[PDB]
């Protein structure tokens, strides 16, 4: 079905590197140079106050929409990944449900500016005080701290591509029917990532990467905060949250 479901040679691992990096370039949502160029474009004190004054439900809806757009690009990335379309429908769903948010959380470090602790949101950079209307300050501060720690690694685009392919192709997700097929694909993606790091003298990042439990905790925290919001505004979720967001998080 796919070469990467079996033992792969060095040449085939070198191709996997190129393939993953290409899949990522084509599905990235925003170019790194565009995000970097816009760093000087920061929300004014008046603009921040305006975001803080929005109703809780309006802020949640805007954030659920922006998240859904980012996730859509992660779905496209998954589809372009060697071997993903060869897995059964159950497993593709299992992988995307558990990993799509994790991939978005990793991709977000490109949009995070560690110099002033701001993130690119709705056309400009803003600090964590911009999301105060959500009423989930601990979750927001935990997300900014994660983006801050990832930023300290100075990831290249190729590294993010290879590391996110691995965040998604995780053979330990409960509910996988073809676990051994996913284990082999994960092994080959692990080799591709570690090969690229070896080749670029970047193996020192391996020890600095966050533990898998960190990404799981951030995703569980998001689902917990959504459940609190859902109990307060059930009609808002039902009527105005994107259907893809609800399939993944509700």
């Amino acid at each position: 079905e796919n070469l990467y479901f079996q033992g792969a040679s060095l040449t085939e691992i070198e191709h996997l590197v190129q393939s993953v990096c290409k899949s990522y370039r084509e599905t990235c949502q925003l170019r790194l140079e565009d995000l970097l160029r816009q760093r000087s474009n920061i929300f004014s004190r008046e603009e921040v106050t305006g975001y803080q004054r929005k109703s809780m439900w309006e802020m949640w809806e805007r954030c659920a929409h922006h998240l859904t757009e980012a996730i859509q690009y992660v779905v496209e990335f998954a589809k372009r990944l060697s071997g993903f379309m060869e897995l059964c429908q159950n497993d593709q769903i299992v992988l995307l449900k558990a990993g799509a948010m994790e991939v978005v959380l990793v991709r977000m470090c490109r949009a995070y500016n560690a110099d002033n602790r701001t993130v690119f949101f709705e056309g400009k950079y803003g600090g964590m005080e911009l999301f105060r209307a959500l009423g989930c300050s601990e979750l927001i501060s935990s997300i900014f701290d994660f983006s801050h720690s990832l930023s300290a690694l100075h990831f290249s685009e190729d590294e993010i591509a290879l590391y996110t392919a691995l965040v998604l192709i995780n053979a330990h997700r409960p509910g996988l029917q073809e676990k051994r097929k996913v284990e082999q694909l994960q092994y080959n993606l692990e080799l591709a990532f570690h090969h690229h790091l070896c080749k670029t003298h970047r193996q020192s990042i391996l020890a600095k990467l966050p533990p898998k439990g960190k990404l799981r905790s951030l995703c569980s925290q998001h689902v917990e905060r959504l459940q609190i919001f859902q109990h307060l505004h059930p009609i808002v979720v039902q009527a105005a949250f994107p259907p893809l967001y609800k399939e993944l998080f509700s």
Partner: peptide, 12 residues
Amino acid sequence: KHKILHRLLQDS
């Protein structure tokens, strides 16, 4: 249901 997810995966 996973209606949207199924649709996204089957759209070539």
